[PDB]
Amino acid sequence: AQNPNCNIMIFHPTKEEFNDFDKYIAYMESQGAHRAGLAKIIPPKEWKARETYDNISEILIATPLQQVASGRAGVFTQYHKKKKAMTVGEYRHLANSKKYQTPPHQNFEDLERKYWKNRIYNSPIYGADISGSLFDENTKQWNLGHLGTIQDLLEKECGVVIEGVNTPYLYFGMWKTTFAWHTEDMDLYSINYLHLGEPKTWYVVPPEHGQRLERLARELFPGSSRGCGAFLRHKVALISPTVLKENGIPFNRITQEAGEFMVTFPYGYHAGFNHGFNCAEAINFATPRWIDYGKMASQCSCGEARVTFSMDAFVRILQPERYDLWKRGQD
Ligand SMILES: O=C(O)CNC(=O)C(=O)O
Ligand SMILES: [Mg+2]
Ligand code: NI
Numbered sequence: 001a002q003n004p005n006c007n008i009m010i011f012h013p014t015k016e017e018f019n020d021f022d023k024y025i026a027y028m029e030s031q032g033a034h035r036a037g038l039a040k041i042i043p044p045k046e047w048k049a050r051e052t053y054d055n056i057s058e059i060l061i062a063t064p065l066q067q068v069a070s071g072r073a074g075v076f077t078q079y080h081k082k083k084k085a086m087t088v089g090e091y092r093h094l095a096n097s098k099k100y101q102t103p104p105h106q107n108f109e110d111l112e113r114k115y116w117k118n119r120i121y122n123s124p125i126y127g128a129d130i131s132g133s134l135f136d137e138n139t140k141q142w143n144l145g146h147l148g149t150i151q152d153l154l155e156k157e158c159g160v161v162i163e164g165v166n167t168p169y170l171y172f173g174m175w176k177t178t179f180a181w182h183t184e185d186m187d188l189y190s191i192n193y194l195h196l197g198e199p200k201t202w203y204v205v206p207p208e209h210g211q212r213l214e215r216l217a218r219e220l221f222p223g224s225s226r227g228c229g230a231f232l233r234h235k236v237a238l239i240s241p242t243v244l245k246e247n248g249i250p251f252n253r254i255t256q257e258a259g260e261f262m263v264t265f266p267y268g269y270h271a272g273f274n275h276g277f278n279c280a281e282a283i284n285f286a287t288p289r290w291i292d293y294g295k296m297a298s299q300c301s302c303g304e305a306r307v308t309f310s311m312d313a314f315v316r317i318l319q320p321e322r323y324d325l326w327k328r329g330q331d
């Protein structure tokens, strides 16, 4: 078996290898990359997502989210308070302010220490989940707005034709902005490109060990666990690397820099934080190997996780028994 310790793998495709997205994903899996839950892909040196970022300040963040924490430094939840709209130029100036900017630090490890020590004491503002793309339409390779759709993958593998669409989302981050522990909707893949700015640190649990993270989460967030059988779908819980190590949970970490892709694999739990002002683009995707994970994915029926139009069809086709109760949660 390839990559039996489930290490995060880093790939350096040539421009020739960068032509066929599906083929490259299947290659990475042939090398065991999925066992980690996360891989890094460094694009060929000749490739570019777009010519410049010089004109992005006019994008609107309609609903910036203030991420307010509760708990202790290593075990906390976050709630998202909605704020007034602001442009990306306004948000960048806020991120660079004395109140919100990245502190002085020695290197990524010192910064990671400072994040886990101090995150809970601040409420950074995250411009998350903004439909749109920053890839130039002329970028033909690994353009996250031109990928084959999940509905077309389900049709090709299973014959069934369903409604729904599959589009990217932009994320504008600042120091301490945080993504809670989660897998993707319907345990899909994700791909994330860091267009610009400061890094993003990721933590990941191997898919084969995801249930160990779930059992710890039930112990650490026991009222949330009684409220919902899949409360990590709410995307609010944080657990630090120190706490994961104290509880024997297998995990890995890696820092993504501007210009780099990350792929998350089906049922790869991940969490992380931004080092400073940045912009990422991400989208979900499927391969044939996902189908079985989609059939088995947990679902939030408490009603909190409240997810897309397109996920309806996935549930209806892959999980017809759940259909009914999951749509009672979503209506
Ligand atoms: O970048 C972020 O805030 C969150 N992104 C993801 O969880 C992802 O790409 O799967
Ligand atoms: Mg603009
Ligand atoms: Ni994700």
Ligand SMILES: [Zn+2]
Residues within 6 Å of the ligand: 227, 228, 229, 230, 231, 233, 234, 300, 301, 302, 303, 304, 305
């Ligand atoms: Zn729920």
